[PDB]
Amino acid sequence: PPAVHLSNGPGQEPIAVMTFDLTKITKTSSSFEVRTWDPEGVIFYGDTNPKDDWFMLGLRDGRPEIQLHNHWAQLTVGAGPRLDDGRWHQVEVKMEGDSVLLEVDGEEVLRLRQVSGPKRHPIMRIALGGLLFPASNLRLPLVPALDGCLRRDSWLDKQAEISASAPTSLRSCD
Amino acid sequence: PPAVHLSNGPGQEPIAVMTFDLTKITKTSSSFEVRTWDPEGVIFYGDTNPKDDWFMLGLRDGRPEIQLHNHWAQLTVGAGPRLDDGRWHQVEVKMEGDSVLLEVDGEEVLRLRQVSGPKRHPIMRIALGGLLFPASNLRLPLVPALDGCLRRDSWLDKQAEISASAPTSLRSCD
Numbered sequence: 001p002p003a004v005h006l007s008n009g010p011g012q013e014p015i016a017v018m019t020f021d022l023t024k025i026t027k028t029s030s031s032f033e034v035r036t037w038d039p040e041g042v043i044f045y046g047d048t049n050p051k052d053d054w055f056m057l058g059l060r061d062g063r064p065e066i067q068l069h070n071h072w073a074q075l076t077v078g079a080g081p082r083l084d085d086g087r088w089h090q091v092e093v094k095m096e097g098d099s100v101l102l103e104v105d106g107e108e109v110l111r112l113r114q115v116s117g118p119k120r121h122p123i124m125r126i127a128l129g130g131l132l133f134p135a136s137n138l139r140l141p142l143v144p145a146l147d148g149c150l151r152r153d154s155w156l157d158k159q160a161e162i163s164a165s166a167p168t169s170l171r172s173c174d
Numbered sequence: 175p176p177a178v179h180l181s182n183g184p185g186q187e188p189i190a191v192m193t194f195d196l197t198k199i200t201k202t203s204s205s206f207e208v209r210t211w212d213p214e215g216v217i218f219y220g221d222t223n224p225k226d227d228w229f230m231l232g233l234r235d236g237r238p239e240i241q242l243h244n245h246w247a248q249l250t251v252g253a254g255p256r257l258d259d260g261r262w263h264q265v266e267v268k269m270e271g272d273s274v275l276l277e278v279d280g281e282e283v284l285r286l287r288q289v290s291g292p293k294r295h296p297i298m299r300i301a302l303g304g305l306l307f308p309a310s311n312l313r314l315p316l317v318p319a320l321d322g323c324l325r326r327d328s329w330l331d332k333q334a335e336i337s338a339s340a341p342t343s344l345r346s347c348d
């Protein structure tokens with residue numbers, strides 16, 4: 001299938017931004033394949049409010065890292081095997097009850113429990129390959145640029161998708 | 175080497191309690207091997223204050239789980255492969271800067287970052303196979319009894335160890 005580069009130019013911004021109608025969401029999971037030799041960077045960032053309800057999945061020291069900041073939890077957690085071996089890796093991130101589940105290559109590697117509740121606005125934004133605020137604003141800053149490739153990505157439900165933007169045309173890893 | 179049973183009788187209390195002088199601690203890591211077919215239970219609990227500075231490592235759905243409650247963080251997190259396959263597994267838990275690192279069979283499977291700071295009293299208690307407060311007091315309750323075996327366990331520095339207790343004689347898995 002067609003693969004896209006996760007970074008463009010200086011790698012200072014996302015390659016794409018998707019907006020979703022929270023009230024129209026029926027599927028709270030996303031999956032994709034990623035390949036990279038880069039040990040650090042942002043795979044995706046998401047929020048309902050950059051001020052107080054945001055989430056980031058990235059790599060640090062080659063391994064998956066999640067940072068989360070919302071009403072119920074504030075955390076910085078590393079888990080899973082290194083993914084920077086230049087091989088394609090399947091990744092799934094989903095909400096399971098009050099938990100966030102991270103699966104890598106079919107195996108559950110991390111489950112953040114009690115991090116959700118009955119999230120700011122009825123709109124969720126998902127940015128690929130970058131953040132929607134300065135990196136200095138992360139709980140634990142890292143350099144966002146992730147020199148890798150993304151393919152076979154499915155995000156929530158297309159029916160709940162409000163819109164999609166791209167600062168520039170998506171560069172193919174072909 | 176000699177192995178010990180992690181549960182006794184009804185599995186309502188720890189098989190042993192160790193107390194340490196925080197000010198005498200130079201090594202902030204522990205390691206041990208565990209074997210079990212039990213998917214849920216407490217491997218060890220530790221605190222400096224059962225009221226507001228405690229930590230628990232156990233199994234839930236066969237996989238490692240850590241619950242932590244202190245001044246800097248409050249979390250419930252699952253990670254790593256299932257350990258309830260009846261095989262011996264090496265486990266290491268250590269403090270690395272402001273993080274808690276969990277290694278299983280030589281592989282880092284979880285790193286809780288930004289959970290420590292410059293912890294209540296100068297005394298730390300470590301209880302094996304049970305908690306030092308009701309299970310209902312966990313962030314996420316579980317049934318503490320862990321039907322497994324422990325061996326080759328090293329806890330912090332023997333020099334910092336103040337005392338050790340055991341409600342009853344340690345039952346051998348021999």
Ligand SMILES: COc1cc2c(cc1O)CC[C@@H]1[C@@H]2CC[C@]2(C)[C@@H](O)CC[C@@H]12
Pocket residue numbers: 028029030045046047048053054055068069070093094095099100115116119124126155156
């Ligand atoms: C658990 O709390 C939160 C979680 C989340 C967010 C905010 C929270 O407060 C924003 C991005 C979300 C992610 C949960 C997992 C999602 C749905 C992925 O499948 C795609 C976008 C991700």
Ligand SMILES: COc1cc2c(cc1O)CC[C@@H]1[C@@H]2CC[C@]2(C)[C@@H](O)CC[C@@H]12
Pocket residue numbers: 202203204219220221222227228229242243244267268269273274289290293298300329330
């Ligand atoms: C990160 O914060 C905390 C961490 C901890 C405790 C309290 C905290 O507030 C108590 C038990 C400790 C564990 C850190 C890891 C230790 C040292 C293991 O090697 C043996 C006992 C464990």
Ligand SMILES: [Ca+2]
Pocket residue numbers: 038039040041143144145146147
């Ligand atoms: Ca990078």
Ligand SMILES: [Ca+2]
Pocket residue numbers: 212213214215317318319320321
């Ligand atoms: Ca049990």
